[PDB]
Swiss-Prot record, chains A, B, C, D:
Keywords: Cytoplasm, NAD, NADP, Oxidoreductase. It catalyses: L-glutamate + NAD(+) + H2O = 2-oxoglutarate + NH4(+) + NADH + H(+); L-glutamate + NADP(+) + H2O = 2-oxoglutarate + NH4(+) + NADPH + H(+). One of its GO terms (molecular function) is glutamate dehydrogenase (NAD+) activity. This is Glutamate dehydrogenase. Belongs to the Glu/Leu/Phe/Val dehydrogenases family. GO terms for biological process: glutamate catabolic process. It comes from the Archaea. GO terms for cellular component: cytoplasm. It is found in: Cytoplasm. The keyword Manganese does not apply. The keyword NADP applies.
């Protein structure tokens, strides 16, 4: 199903680099459970309006399903299905004891009041209560949903479950007053930083200090990456961009300042003491590290040939296309694939659940240290195969993921071969 | 959703004969909950194969959802959704304390072995367990499912629930050894029979004795109806048919002998002493009562005109089209609309559930007599509105049904208007 | 406790007339379980407002506790405890398999909107969920609450319990679209009629036909009673009254017609087909039967002496004081005590519960017939002790009640003597 | 409520120093849930005796409620409500993922036998089962209850819950044979020591080594503190006292040796290696640190003026009155308020719960180390506000606490402002 069609495809590819039965394959192509519900919401005007919602649990062989809830007017089931499958792979690559899940509500949130948003949130839990549990299915935030929304959902869950289960553990991305974890805001960037650090290593880099990075996108990820790489790495952020434009400066930019600028003007554009550039231009800079952190399909057939970075850190999802991959590989450019690169969020989300279920909370330092250990390992799991089978890192990432899900399905007896 | 699509119509149509808000209409148009699952079955060859199943709960305002499970290679979600909405109207018309539901497995049952069928039935329960209960959603047999399939499904349900709930009550259509109800096989015919009986009364008939009825279709229902009308009501069964054609005999036929002949021969066709006719002719005889109990859309624009019967007892589902409805209504023919006419089966399924949850089983006499009361009442409920609003019986049947559901929704506060 | 104190008093009295241990007495003087909660309600102005609620479970020796929920600005816990203990005696006098319970919310419902009422009702359930169930504690309507309120409470219960238990059975007094019982409105009046019928029999009356009755109060109870006593028994309803006043007519009033008058004008007062009297006068009429069906303490030391009726049917709660009881008793007036006389309501609530849990609904005639049997039985159980001990009926009623609770406690081992 | 009134008072105070809505305030002034039950106990003489019990759950915004059970002849519900609200502030000041709760039984334990105590303890659990759980409300020992009592309560819980939830986690203060935590006995003293250590740091002291301390009270708390401050910090314990009197020695007492004296004689009074003083005098000694670890209200308007210590570590609950607080504060005396100072006990109870739910037990050193971290943190969280606002530490402690509860409520949507 277009988007859903795409996954099965990715699935088909990996298969060419590994051994897996057709039995296993057919099973993986279909999500194990899908629930689709009608949520009636009492609008502020005193009438009720109904919304359509879904929760998709793709696979739970390796453990409870994990994955966000999107609130969006063009949401469809296919998309939610495609995204749940992706979570299956991401959780496996990071070696977490989780499967993949995803949910969504077909709604335009900008039209709802907070009261109405709260009602919608609670209504979603009331509708799906039966298929979720701290040991079954753990949602999280995504497009258009946030900690506030997670909090309302948790509260409704606590009300129905009657405090007979560790309710804080039903969902992640929570505010800290009620079980949230430290490290959540910087999670992705922080996680990507460790992979960049290992890439440099394998690459033979002396250090990162002084190296250069260009970052496309100036959101949380963008901003945080910029900040970490700079203050923690010693790198030089010579360029950043936003939907408006990029900006250049070889002496390197200051994350925070660029940040305020953006605040005041609405674009990174014009920042003082720097040259304005296009996004296109940004991608082609001659840098040690290119970190595309905004939207997909920025690296294609077209410009692939002009990329000049040594390392492409995919922070955003789907930045590099498939043909571009081939070119890049052939060029000797090392890519840190999306689902591996930006996995720091799901990982910290996993640490949140551990803290909620054990009732013991961690420090930002413990969070970072454990995240470092997880990302490093994952990095190598992939690198190693890639090298071992002489294949593209992304292909190698699917192989590691699929093989772990497959082995769990075999040990359980879900498939016989 | 073609089919589903169909249903919306019916809703919109009845809406014109009664007052109901958009709030409620909109709600009624969407099913409350849908579950789609992948059921892996270990085949006899030792490999696993996956199948797609669904369970739809359209509306439960009036009580737990009720409806069969179809096993069929051309099954779609659209259809299952469409059949679930229908069960909502049907339970409401009968005034049962239930809502509507329906399930389906996309499968070609002719290719599975018995062991494989057993595994599939158990797998369906293992997959939808969380959304079923004796007070939540009660399946039953349908296309290609039967008592056997029901029994394996109950057993598995009992195994998962640990006998902590009245398990026999999870599903109906069961074998008598484990809680089935007497009267199950004759139910549809028996029910229809009471409706024909009240219809004669409203039409002024004196008695049914010696009146004539032609029955199109000679399966369970056609056969039992033949048998009942004649033996119990003293009517003359002048013609019956099967897919290979009809037989005519103005002196009245013997249901049993016809049955015997069919078994032995394959068709009612060539029954001794009778005259062979086409189905098409059967529909046009001049009888007091015509009961289409085979397939749909047998009476249309084309022949509605030729219909000579005073009463049309819609035993099969959808034998009469909308254009045909108009005409026959014009002609002053009295129609007993499918979902009212053949509701004896759901009705007895309700009685089976009652016996299971109370643990007290009834005699066939008790069964038959409570069925009469129910059928008789549902009949006049529909008939009175019909007259009183001077509308078609079918229209009145939707009116009675939608009004009940709507009222329950309002009482609960699911719609505010 | 004042109100609560009065209960001990009552309990200490029956003890004179029966042998019961101190162990028991003391257990009986205290409710087994009290839950007091704070219910936050989101008001229409979007601010949150907190209300105080309670549910008192006095004694459940004989079965699940049963009792209404009152919404009133001056509710107090003492009152609710006192009324829970009363339900204990009432269910026992009727021989129902229940104990007594009661709830209340301190609120002035007159200032809330519907939306706000709905939210307070769902909130109470969300607050006391853990201590209620169809086999544990079943509420019902009372001061300021009604079927609509019950409906919202059932709905919330259903949503929290996930349809895994027979939810319609959680609370009684529901609307008929969702599990309500036929017979609910006339229940009280209807139950009292059977008691009046037996009291006349034991009095040696010939028939009721032609006898006379005066009814104080013209609500549901007063009106239905008037209606029933006349139309069903052939009594002459010579006077009825309301808070504005009474009306009289020796030939008999026509209940419906007086109802309509009251409806337009607001009082039965000035009805054209009668002469006006006062409430005080009404109590002193010379009728065969006097039925105070309005408020308490209308027959005291002051006028007790003027009572001329042969039978005083206590429809209302506490219309005769203890001092008056003595007087009437010496005068040979037969009193049908409140908790016995007006028990048809709880009894029909018991029937609603049965229909809900068994899933099988009764006709008005079934309701009536079973009601009759229950009431008649309870009447003689009481009457026999009074006679045999030569005691006031009220005293005999407590004796019958307490002993039954006492014995169930001994059998359970709750008390050892 | 007097006791309860005093809470509102306290809450109304912190409000001066912080911005908080009325909506919140009002919610906070009432406990969310109260359960009062009657517990029947089979006495040794074989008669049944009924006792009154309660469990109050003040607020669970931040997590499961936490708090002890008191057995005392003069318990009242007002007191238990008041103490539940206090636990709410205490768990919050410590940043624990809990809310506050408390229970009590009106009994004089001194008249019961062990068999009888056992039965009352199991009875309370059988009575409040529905409202407790390892993730819902976790009790602990208090006035007149202890580990043995806790053990019997856990056992009964385990029997009712069927071992389906982590039962050891239902209650804390357990014996070590069944899930108790190391560090429990010294907890209070130990926690206070870390606070004393930081208060000296913020005071600019050099070391504690050689400083002096006077301890009022020579129970567990007094003794362990004395023991710890001397042996672990090198302070000189110059005076200790008990209800019979105090003893003094400028060179420092030896805690153990004084303990033994007390043990044989019954009072620290007359210890040979010191001179006798009074409690009043003890409070007025000129020491670096004064620790009232006995009873309340020993520092009032009367002598507040005579206090010579630089640090007053409130070990006991409420030893200094509000009027005295003002005086000491102007004098520049640093007070470590009770609920902060003596929180090591609840904190170690929090650790016991963690070990029980995770099934992994810690060493005394792990206990100590985590305790330290918790206490230190809480100290500065408090200290910083006081400093910054120039407010009494006690006021700063309520500010820190209330705000945390308040924020968790806003996030849940419990209050909207």
């Amino acid at each position: 199903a277009d988007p859903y069609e795409i996954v099965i495809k990715q699935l088909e590819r990996a298969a060419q680099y590994m051994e897996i039965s057709e039995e296993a394959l057919e099973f993986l192509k279909r999500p194990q459970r899908i629930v689709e519900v009608t949520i009636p919401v009492e609008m502020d005007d005193g009438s009720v309006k109904v919304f359509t919602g879904f929760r998709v649990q793709h696979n739970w062989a390796r453990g409870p399903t994990k994955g966000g809830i999107r609130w969006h007017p063009e949401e469809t089931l296919s998309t939610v299905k495609a995204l749940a499958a992706w979570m299956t792979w991401k959780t496996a690559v990071m070696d977490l004891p989780y499967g993949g899940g995803k949910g969504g509500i077909i709604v335009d949130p900008k039209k709802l009041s907070d009261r109405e948003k709260e009602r919608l949130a609670r209504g979603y839990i009331r509708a799906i209560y039966d298929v979720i549990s701290p040991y079954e299915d753990i949602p999280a935030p995504d497009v258009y949903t946030n900690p506030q929304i997670m909090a309302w959902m948790m509260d409704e869950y606590e009300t129905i479950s009657r405090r007979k289960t560790p309710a804080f553990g039903i969902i992640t991305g929570k505010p800290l007053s009620i079980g949230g974890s430290l490290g959540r805001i910087e999670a992705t960037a922080r996680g990507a930083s460790y992979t960049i650090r290992e890439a440099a290593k394998v690459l033979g880099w002396d250090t990162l200090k002084g190296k250069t990075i260009a970052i496309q996108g100036y959101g949380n990820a963008g901003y945080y990456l910029a900040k970490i790489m700079s203050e923690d790495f010693g790198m030089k952020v010579v360029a950043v961009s936003d939907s408006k434009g990029g900006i250049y400066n070889p002496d390197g930019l200051n994350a925070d300042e660029v940040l305020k600028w953006k605040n005041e003007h609405g674009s990174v554009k014009d920042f003082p003491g720097a040259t304005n550039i296009t996004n296109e231009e940004l991608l082609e800079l001659e840098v040690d590290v290119l970190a595309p952190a905004a939207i997909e399909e920025v690296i294609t057939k077209k410009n692939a040939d002009n990329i000049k970075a040594k390392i492409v850190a995919e922070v955003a999802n789907g930045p590099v296309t498939p043909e571009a991959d081939e070119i890049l590989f052939e060029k000797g450019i090392l890519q840190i694939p999306d689902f591996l690169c930006n996995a720091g969020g799901v990982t910290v989300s996993y640490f949140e659940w551990v803290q909620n279920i054990t009732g013991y909370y961690w420090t930002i330092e413990e969070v970072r240290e454990r995240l470092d250990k997880k990302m490093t390992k994952a990095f190598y799991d992939v690198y190693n195969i890639a090298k071992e089978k002489n294949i593209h890192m992304r292909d190698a990432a699917y192989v590691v993921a699929v093989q772990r899900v497959y082995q769990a399905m075999l040990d359980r007896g879900w498939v016989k071969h």
